[model samples]
Target: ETTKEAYHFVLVPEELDNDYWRLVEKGAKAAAKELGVDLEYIGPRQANIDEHLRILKKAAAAKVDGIITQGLTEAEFVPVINEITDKNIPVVTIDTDAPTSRRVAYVGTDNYYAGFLAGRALAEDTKGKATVAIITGSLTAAHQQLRVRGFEDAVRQEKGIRIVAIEESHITRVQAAEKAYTILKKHPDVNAFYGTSALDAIGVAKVVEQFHREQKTYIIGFDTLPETIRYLQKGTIAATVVQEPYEMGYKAVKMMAEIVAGKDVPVVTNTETKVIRKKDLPL
Candidate 1:
């Protein structure tokens, strides 16, 4: 007979105000229950790297059984991650990566590949003749940067797709909306927009609707939040790369539990990403 040992793990997301991490939390909670471990989902209300770092310190200081978090930036987080690992606490990064850190494993999407997928989707939609703008959560986040780079590489291969501008959304709906509007106004010829964060699609859609440019501008965004899906159904958003946060959360905790149980775990666990369009939706 096999009995599960009790363990405690904490999940710290980059922020908690949106549907993306909520899905992640749902997955983590389910895993916690299944694995017979205590789980706490906590994070800053907004996307603040410093705040996330502080939370990591506190969790590590308390010597929790494990930690699952998004690595905001390698330079900013490696030392803190080392501190936590030095405490003999296992840390796992999800959604974003901190490759240089001491974290035991990373469980999330292959963001660069997802970006290339989005870029190709956009290129095909526009027939490669479009001026594109990018709105991202944070340049400091490794995943966000990698996504952009991937998109850029794909764009270079498409002759008529040109990049116009790149803006930071601070990972807020309001900020993303504002940036989209401003970019649209400044670059009237931009026909495609890529949002590298979840809230970005909704934000861009709002402005595109207000300006009645839904027919003229196409948006490709990240994540499968309900609002993003709604916009896609309404023909506001062209496409979205859906990352499996639920799977990421579940696998993260499961890996942590195994590690705590002295079981071997892999160094990287990649989740999945799929592109969702209006045609793919259930009516």
Candidate 2:
């Protein structure tokens, strides 16, 4: 039976099987069910811009009721999102944001603020003295750049804290581990780390644990995936910047529903973000 009366929306992510994205998808699924709207999910096998573009283009071509996706990169995504919005289909961004676009609203963490908290966590745990290495998922993505920039600013005042190297993980666990290994090999003084995405921290943890620097290294990474949390519990990851995927996904749909009803909504809506350490976890 075709439910022609219900609204339909497409939720596209950078990768189809990404654990972080899966959580976001979960929240959207719950809200869509509650609101009796259709939500279609699509994305690439990995984080390829070409595949991502094609997926977005396909969703837009279908001319669905509305669209939900991220601003993976300003250059690649802004134009595609704007074109979709121009076609009069409401678009909302979750997790990653594009403030300048015609999107109805962005529902996610203030990435810069989140990154700042990670930096502050590092400085606080390390007593404002540490040689830090940064692992970023995307060097070109607007959100990722903002996160790195915020972390850089957060530690600018700490004269003893030096950022030794910044490397790209391409948002993969294997690459994250490789970069961390290389950084540690080159800079034996690296006592701190900041991973800008979910898998980055887990990858870094693998290296830190092997090097037996769990007690010496202060790591602050993004996302609260199982492995990341496990490392945090074992003292390999000093801190984790947690984002509310469920909340963002839920709020994004609510915002889209409001727009569909011709009700005004805020251009930007931010969810909570915080750095969690051992104490923050339950016993």
Candidate 3:
């Protein structure tokens, strides 16, 4: 009997401890099983761009057939992605993009547009008259940066809404809670809090609960993590922008498989997002 060769692909997420990436991994695994490819999912346990870079280089040295990763920032990951592409290995970025790099394509939500939608929702929730604070993951990540920009551009047009503070959590829940507490304490009049990162909302909600202000503060957040949804159900979080991360992972690998088969792929493939409210909760 002859053994068939398998195409090996490596998936490097931004980090692995969260539900957002877990959904992405679930989709990637489904694709790998159906496509008959050997898939290895790996990444830093934390949001360490340097560790991500190190893993990518090692994967390149090992000569994996293809690479799929989340691009932190163009400055941080472009050179590394270019180096990977220089070795003739195909690369695709997911959930975030490094546009300046030689990666073949980007598969994820249009973060800017998503953020715009988020801001619009925020405006509506606060009745267009609210002082808002922000909790975000990384300042350097393209997705986070663009999300903030899109949000600001949209909300800035509203004469009633003012962005009071923008704080970084570095994607850490503890820092997210601390920042939320500080912002809430410093600006007692703030009526709204928006979390641009998945875990940020949970942190923010915790702080709100601790201060017994759940009914007072309207929370808007990105991603549909379980806690986020629970908060939405409890009316602690008014709304959340949910992304299709599963499709992002599946499409990234599917495109990589097609690329390996000598098929042409798109330069940019955008996923979708929707605003989830209390009524949108899944049973």
* lDDT scores of the candidates, listed in order: 0.87, 0.88, 0.89
List all candidate RMSDs to the true structure: 2.9, 1.5, 2.1
lDDT of 3 by residue, 1-283 (tens): 0223888899998887667888999999899999989888889998788999999999999888999998788887998999899999999999998888899999998999989999999888777888899999978888999899999987987999999999999887899999998997788888788899898989998988988843598889998878888899999889999899999999999999988888999999999787879987773
Better TM-score candidate (1, 2): 2
User: For residue 233, what is the lDDT in candidate 3?
Assistant: 90
Q: Write the per-residue lDDT of candidate 1 for residues 1-283, one digit (tens) a residue.
A: 0223456688998887667889999999999898778888879997788999999898888767899998878888989888889889999999888888888999999888999888888888888888999999888888999999988887788888899899999888899999988997899888888999988878888988998843578899998888888889888898999899899999999988888878889888888887778888972
So what's the TM-score on candidate 3?
A: 0.95
Candidates sorted on lDDT, descending: 3, 2, 1
* Best of the candidates, lDDT: 3
User: How far off is residue 205 in model 2, in Å?
Assistant: 0.6
What lDDT is reached at residue 260 by model 2? 91
How many pairs of residues in model 3 come into backbone collision?
0
Evaluation by lDDT, superior candidate among 1 and 3 = 3
Alpha-carbon deviation at 61 in model 2, angstroms: 0.8
What candidate 3 gets wrong by more than 4 Å, as runs, is: 1-4
